């Protein structure tokens, strides 16, 4: 698996975890598969091997992977310990480094060391004098002999005390002691031995492993790919597909047992993103609004509606017989203003039709011209402002009369027959950041090795940059202004008198019909005109990423308010100013990936930065790994088939299907579940998905990353078991309602994992089978997803992680006629069936034997692969196996 | 140092050309990367470097100089540089290097994005002089990578 | 005192295990010819001869 090993190389494994006997034991192994070792000369060969092995102790930082100081030592030739496993066929030695056992030998149980070397369970590892010992004796660190001195190391050497007090030492002096191993090249048995250990030692800092790796993050099934014309970037370009998993190995040993780990993914795309975005709301003063226009609300994807916000000094709005009551009100410097939120619809409604749960209005300071934000309160002192409806049948006009200070103003809204909404289409700087989590506990310590999703189903916040500018005409007594935000959005401010304010603003939602009216940006810019020494027109604007749930517009969080100033020492003046503007969208997790496709932040273009987080003991990986999203179209590969592979029930047909993108579990005989939780990362908690290894779906509670977090009993337990009746397939058992929280090696149930809404999977990927002349098909409506235990092909030799995954799918097929028409109790045997874990069986009657065939259609288990290769015709691959016309 | 591309005759079966920046004295023991943005600004970031008890921080050690195109009936076409396009054509926060004790930073501009910006064919036909650059504050140099695309 | 210098490789500047060695000739600055050693002094009426 990982770390990779070379021919005759040296590697290490730390003994730690839940149930560890003692912290500080490191097992150094050297591969002795190159020569054969018997029990009559094992002492000699191990003596030579430990004579040729050297152990390096290094000083570094607790955040870096850069060698800062190194010293070498060697095992003694007298009083040392050496062992040899003939089943795992490697020579291994245990060394005690950390507290308590640093210079005192300790006994290592066979059963716990068997976790990192299974072979010790079958054949008892050899020791010196040719005796097979049942327990391992650790070589004390203080007994090692210096290579450059020829003497055993002292008891007061700095690295020894550092190991003996590692916790306090690394905590205080921020110096890190890292061990490693090397094998001086030598020839024995006609074969050479030499190598060095990929850092897999007692505890390296919590970063993504980059040595000697040229990328750091990588996926073995990418290495074993059919790169037709992309052969100039094979190992140069760490690409991943759609929602598939990319492997990482986090070195982290600051805790014992299982360690949750948080991941943050940053997606960027080479292209200025042209976004069409709808106006979820318009907020402006009664004078700032036009006297008359045509408007109709835009219906959203969650029941929300577009509404208008009228701000007036009047206590009410009057439209003749209709009166509008305070939706909300606020006060600045003693002056009171009323904000009324009205939905333009098919009728006038007094009752609250929707709500805003948090909206902050900004205004410049009277004395310092600095932004000040206040939450609008209702007439009953509530921070959830109601939003009503006004309007009627198409063509109806309503004239709302309000007061701006002492001046009456009117606005005439015409109810159009079609939504008369203002839509902004602008080029914007955009990128995305998403969060994920996974509990990792593997027998590869210090490597916590796992695979992370390319796009997890979590709260994905798309961030972005644009510009805001303000132009204004300034006089001695009044000043008018306009502001441009989001690169094409315009707001106006009538001539603002002295010491007076004028409010305007917009709430904008993505115009795509999947996140419209679910996430938004709220900008409320107030303006103040004043004269202290020069005529000053100041603008203060808030920035609120915003979300809709239960028809309530609730604020997720608020950004730093921005401020602009226009100063004029002359009576007539024209002034301008500019500032950056921040765009943010916390998309709903269910649509988050879809939103990532909608904004164009995924495909063959995207590049992904990865950061890790020690969720238990609070470390952030200063290292940021990298990979790239790309889509390779699935292909097919077939060969002529012998009739012998159809006759006897031991000869079958193997079909090779190329589709890297359907892999969502690159580990044979493995499975995992997922659950939504508030994940702790950096200094805040964001909704995310924690992945739990195993086959049980739980219902955790509390705040992830604290003592509040505690996973409860298994809500359901998924088990792949043999099913009675016809044949003997291995199929899933459990509550299918949690297939969206379950993932396996099988790609015919992994589309539930991310793209699932209302209990049904949006995506439909993986293998599919049809069979003729007797029409049979799988997945069938009578079989739940996961009706086989199909395992992906193991990774080959050049892959750094052998036996994980391979884009080639080798499917085993039997085509026959003989057992068709048979009876199993009351069941009839005819058509297509699943057997074993990877076997498909097609049975046809006597009349359908001539030309009986199976057609295999493999579809990507990825949304991007379906989208990007629909035109080329290479997103699904089909092939056929048929009974040959034989003489 | 140098800045170049996988090939000078890349066909349109792949729609993303990775920019190779090989800087001798710019790297560190892996990992080490470069944030890019604003003006292709090489925010060289390696918090994984330590030199006797001190961690490393951001070093604003370069920026992509320009992306110019030759169109010469007599005209060396120096492109008027637009900030938004330039930052978004190189938005990658982490360009990791490859070899230890040697800067082999990996960046990249994709063909589909440039074509969508230019409203051209996806992979059918597209060709200009397409000369991107990079300025390194390593020794203060201007490296250039020129490319022309073949239909297929 | 004299000085001795040689061309320097950039590799001796990149990784924190490769450094630059500069050779300076000055015999006269040695006042303690023993590595990892030190000593102190004090004024006293020393007995010598008679």
Residue numbers in the entry:
A (entry chain D): 1 to 887
B (entry chain A): 888 to 1039
C (entry chain A): 634 to 683
Copy the relevant paper text.
Surface layers (S-layers) are resilient two-dimensional protein lattices that encapsulate many bacteria and most archaea. In archaea, S-layers usually form the only structural component of the cell wall and thus act as the final frontier between the cell and its environment. Sulfolobus acidocaldarius is a hyperthermophilic and acidophilic Crenarchaeon and thrives in acidic thermal soils and hot springs worldwide. The Sulfolobales S-layer lattice stands out from others because it is a two-component lattice, consisting of the S-layer-forming SlaA and the membrane anchor SlaB.
To address this knowledge gap, we performed cryoET and subtomogram averaging (STA) on S. acidocaldarius exosomes with improved imaging conditions and processing techniques. Exosomes are naturally secreted S-layer-encapsulated vesicles, with a diameter of about 90–230 nm. To analyse the in situ structure of the S-layer, we performed STA using Warp, Relion 3.1, and M and obtained a cryoEM map at 11.2 Å resolution. We fitted our structure of SlaA into the S-layer map, which provided an atomic model of the assembled lattice. SlaA assembles into a sheet with a thickness of 95 Å. The long axes of the SlaA subunits are inclined by an angle of about ~28° with respect to the curved S-layer surface. As a result of this inclination, effectively two zones in the SlaA assembly can be distinguished: an outer zone consisting of D1, D2, D3, and D4, and an inner zone formed by D5 and D6. Six SlaA monomers assemble around a hexagonal pore of 48 Å in diameter (glycans not included). The D1 domains of these six monomers project into and define the shape of the hexagonal pore, together with the domains D3 and D4. The D3 domain of each monomer overlaps with the D4 domain of the following monomer along the hexagonal ring in a clockwise fashion. The triangular pores that surround the hexagonal pores have a diameter of ~85 Å and are defined by the D2, D4, D5, and D6 domains of three SlaA molecules.
